[PDB]
Subunit: 424 residues, 4 copies
């Protein structure tokens, strides 16, 4: 009945040694990819926030200094959380970095992306609603073993699922930290905030939304002049990635709404032709679980996505896989009867990819019959891959946990909305 991996699972083991860094993770730390946020936890004493790093070829060893913090949540006290931004990195260079410089040093590595550009290829993993059940471990293995070979994960929210435990037992953030480390210590994960990150629990006097998640997973939101960690953009290779918060305000005149309207004007499709939006709650979703929860955001932002010709919108939240047709539903005017989606070659494809495991439960009840806006849907565990070839073509595939690591149960060519708007 509980498919969550027990506490003594191998994926949760504590790196040995006095004050050994654990829960190590990295993410892009600037707007174009010359910087990296390095994050980790030490449990025995505060320790140093210094990060030692060097490129595998030059080898001059540099130190970066960051910041230490802690938080409480009901009767849980966190370890000592470190966040340190390494900057001015060279493009397309393998770096080594070390954490724990005062006591037990641990060494990792990452490869910086190429410089942003029109035809730069890059491979993104899509993972949503991961959790720490056995299905979660299989998904992460299927991603690590992908022959497509993913270089950055776009994570569309719902991370540890710790809020399911009594009092949100934040020990389950620590176990998730150690479990995902074997991926996100070596390549950036791009964080979207889901509903399991809100952790609004007034009954135990914890009413600050996103508190544990926000303390543990930093994002470079200032780099795109956002005033909140929960919405932001980054550019990587030939992609411009916009990260939105389903569970923050997006009313007209609110900060998120203001930021996004202004951020879409800065997109340059001749520098980054692939325009990608991440959000947690899907705007198009023909499952019963969470059906039409995305309507509110859709009324605010769908016309914008069409007007600026977003290529693809990735969401999670529904524990299943779905791929829409290119449609829009933006002609409604209350009394004009125009409330059915139509094909629209200026509209993104919406993909739901919230099926990486969560706590062991798949969403299988679909609306019937399958609506026209729904191109493909299936209730199986898996992950996605968005493989950009060049300015016109990107190949998307869905890998199921029950198939071999090189089998795509679904696959579609994306034809760029700016450089190549062919029907797909």
């Amino acid at each position: 009945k509980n498919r969550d991996m027990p506490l003594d699972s191998d994926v949760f083991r504590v790196p040995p040694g006095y004050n050994a860094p654990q829960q190590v993770h990295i993410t892009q730390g600037d707007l174009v990819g010359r910087a990296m946020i390095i994050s980790w936890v030490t449990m025995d004493e505060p320790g140093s926030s210094a990060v030692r790093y060097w490129s595998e070829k030059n080898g001059r060893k540099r130190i970066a200094k960051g910041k230490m913090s802690t938080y409480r949540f009901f009767n849980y006290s966190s370890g000592f959380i470190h966040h340190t931004t390494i900057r001015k990195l060279k493009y397309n260079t393998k770096y080594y970095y070390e954490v724990g410089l005062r006591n037990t040093t641990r060494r990792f590595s990452f490869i910086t992306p190429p410089q942003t550009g029109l035809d730069v290829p890059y491979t993104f993993g899509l993972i949503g609603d991961l959790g720490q059940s056995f299905d979660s471990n299989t998904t992460l293995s299927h991603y690590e073993l992908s022959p497509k070979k993913g270089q950055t994960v776009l994570f569309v929210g719902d991370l540890s699922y710790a809020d399911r435990y009594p009092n949100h037992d934040n020990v389950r953030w620590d176990t998730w930290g150690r479990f995902t480390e074997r991926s996100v210590a070596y390549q950036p994960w791009i964080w979207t905030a889901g509903n399991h990150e809100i952790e609004f629990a007034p009954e135990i006097n914890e009413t600050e939304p996103f508190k544990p998640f926000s303390y543990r997973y930093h994002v470079p939101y200032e780099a795109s002049q956002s005033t909140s960690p929960f919405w932001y953009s980054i550019k990587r290779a030939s992609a411009h990635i916009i990260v939105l918060s389903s569970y923050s305000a997006y009313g007209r005149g609110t900060p998120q709404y203001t930021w996004l309207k202004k951020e879409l004007r800065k997109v340059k499709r001749s520098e980054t032709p692939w325009l990608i939006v991440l959000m947690h709650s899907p705007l198009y979703n023909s499952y019963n679980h969470h059906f039409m929860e995305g309507e509110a955001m859709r009324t605010k932002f769908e016309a914008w996505f069409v007007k600026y010709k977003v290529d693809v919108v990735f969401a999670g939240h529904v524990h299943a896989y779905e791929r829409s047709e290119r449609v829009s539903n933006i002609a409604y005017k209350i009394t004009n009867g125009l409330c059915t989606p139509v094909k629209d070659q200026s509209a993104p494809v919406y993909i739901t990819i919230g099926d990486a495991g969560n706590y062991g439960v798949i969403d299988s009840n679909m609306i019937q019959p399958q609506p026209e806006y729904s191109a493909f849907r299936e209730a199986s565990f898996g992950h996605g891959m968005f493989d950009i070839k060049n300015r016109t073509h990107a190949h998307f595939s869905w890998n199921r946990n029950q198939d071999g690591v090189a089998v795509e149960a679904d696959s579609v060519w994306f034809f760029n909305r700016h450089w190549y708007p062919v029907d797909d």
Copy 2:
């Protein structure tokens, strides 16, 4: 530029060293036995103590409150006092004094009757007031009304200070001195509008609602809300729910969670009249801000129908509108059911955002008038929601161009719980 100039009589500084100014009150508890007393001192911090006594008991007590200050760009505020008087007697006239240390000023208010089934009560409805000459006329029409408003339900957009350069917060101070002649003597129930957001990254002011939330306090914890921007009060026979159009309301957010559990706590056997206040109207056939209320409608409209809300008041559109009782809660993306229909279980939606703002009326309407809209007109004015008993409340809309006793629109509400009968005009 129809805003009143700085040396207008309504803006005068009360005389005397450190005379309290911008005095205002609002309900300070869930049921009406408390008042939050608020004012500003400009010359020095002064005391936060409030001396108060009832006309009959005569015993003079002291309440102690708190002082705060804020900055916004290159404006620094004076000294803001918030003091809550508690454990008052119902239906009792009280005097209170502020500015104990140097220049004292005396005012009065009348606590509401105890909450009960047939308790009559007359609520003013004012939205988008601003500080134009139109604003002053409306306030004059409200205070001279023959129906005698006892509480103002204020549906957002207060000072419009954010239209001035750097949101020149002096225009918050002027508005507090203007409105004082009403809100020092009777509560105003505050809803946050978009002019209260004051999100201004270009001058490093990124904290939404900061001036408003410093100047106007609400009893939000009394309904176990975690934020000033949504909360609930009961007063006489009304249960009043105040929502924030410019806060989060997705599933699982604080305001969504609070609202869902707040609706369950409404007892129509105790407070018959269920009133919702918000700034952006769910139903609005004017072109200005057309369909901006759609996002909140998708989350909450079915909840309003399920709980048989009597009336939803909003502002934002600078005009007046009264809807039919309608719902639009059957849409399923592909089924074509996106037209509102008559629904006796649904509230009446009233836009009342025509109190004056900076002097501009919203006249462009969508033609012809849709079936869902009962009455609309692009004129300045205000409203009165006059509860008679558990079955009947009389709503009336008064225009600034008419005399203060003339109702250009008028409807008898049949209470959705105790008199669930078609009340359309």
Copy 3:
């Protein structure tokens, strides 16, 4: 090391889920009508509500206080509760309950009589207590005394946790559980000693007095002090001034300014007995900490004489000493007058820092005994300051090696204001 082990009986954890522990009370206002109720819960934050009733009227009432936490290096505190009960009736037994949500525990205390000229009261005097076995024997002698102390005047150095590695704040927890059998039932008046400073920059803990000040609250605002470390209370016929040896006391500083105004507020027609507490002694003829009190003496000794202070109690030296009435205030740099003289307007200075500490007595004394020193001895013990009326107070010192009713030293105090007879 003579510190009692962690498994000692005195350190037992009260049973039951989130049972309040480390329960301590102190006077909560200026005149004795309020009490600060303090305790720690370990399993979860719990309620800060205190339920209380007098013996006389038996009406249960609720007072609500505040919860707080702190960190010190790699230690995290439990949940600390401070709640003030007010409007208590004079000379009256109260019962109070803490832990209202899970495991409740009930205690009692007796308010002092109203302040007046001739109101009798017995103050205990305990200094540099620690948690050695010697500390336990002192505490036992106090609670078994036939003199029956009604309040402890505590002259500083509490737990000595700062002697443990990283000041192991677990040893504050043990001390609170150990002292509870006394301070849960009668107020202790806190003075801050040097072991409470805990200035440890080498582990980035630089806020002076931080652990002490979170765990032990004083009614400092009731005498218009701006700092917990100096303040005044009145109780029965006593006006008690508590001073901070390790805060600033230069001319113009907060402590200096507060003390100058506060001596002018003493009304000996209401509280005849004027008592000053401080950690470091102004008159001390032992070698350990010899002359460390000179700095405060230069600043405050002439004030104590001018305001006819009856007695100054201090700790810091791990032994007992009682001075004659002397002053050393005629010094003008070049006039040679630096010898203390008998001055029947001066206080008696008493060192009483011998309650046990970590098991070490200070036995090195300057020989021969100076004329200013009336009696001194290197033995563990405590004091009793037993007020009879406005003229007469009996002070006695009890040694840990004697019977609980044996006074190894005693002296009648004749009040400096109401009865200035030679009491040599």
Copy 4:
């Protein structure tokens, strides 16, 4: 009274929208390679950036700092900028600009030589300046000294704003505009005095040193202090220790702990001139504040003799005094030894708090002159401590009533480490 009126020329507000005012600099690191740049903008927040370049390179760089504000009773401050420029070159003139967003103003300073055994350097000594007409005359005399002061060691009591009703902090702003003509072009080294405490509970202002600590930053973490009110710096051949008379200094306290460790780091072969600054004098034979320094003297006087401090500079007494080299550290309560004695290991104690304050001089003296006092006079003026090399430093005192080149008192300091002969 005798304070200069608000419309005086020294108080004039620099013109242009949001033009920086109250510009002041101080040393920014331990050894002299850094400078803290400080200033106020009144019209809006503005930029905290400082553009700077050397006269030699001309490569203009930018350093970014921080903006802060404070209230005090019914006063609200302007926007206070502190920005630290680092990696400066030794012995080099730099220009710097503040006010980059609207009205830019330009200044300059000259970095000190690198620290060394025989490095000459000329220090000014000012205490208790205030803003009376007397204060302006002392500043003029300092600016016009033929010895050319390169840094001011300032021993406390700055604006005397706390004498006005509610400490009227406008009188901090004016003092900032008045002193700028000096402290914008050379560091002043800041010591906290009693008029900086501003403990005013009757108007609910209880944070000690608040207005001063907002407006004047020091490089206290460079010497591993945890408080701005005590710290050290090295400059040329001087090691300078700044103490806080009005902070705690009992055994085990932060300032006590810091001073005992700091004295162990002193290297007389790198900086042979060991200098202590404090506000309250440990030696003082005037009736005003007589013996107020006794408490700090019980704690620190033996450390000064032990480490052979050359000179201790203090203010607070509104006059001038130069002690003999004496110590008074033998007292043991009953041994009777409480008279100071000639001590060639001891520093000279100079009271130099006569720079003007609000117009009033302290003229009552203990009579007769004690053996431990060498020279004392109740006149307005300032001091100069002129280091020639590791053995010789010339101290001069200049009175406001004399010519700017006249030294009414002067003495040769022989270094206690390198040349401890009777002076």
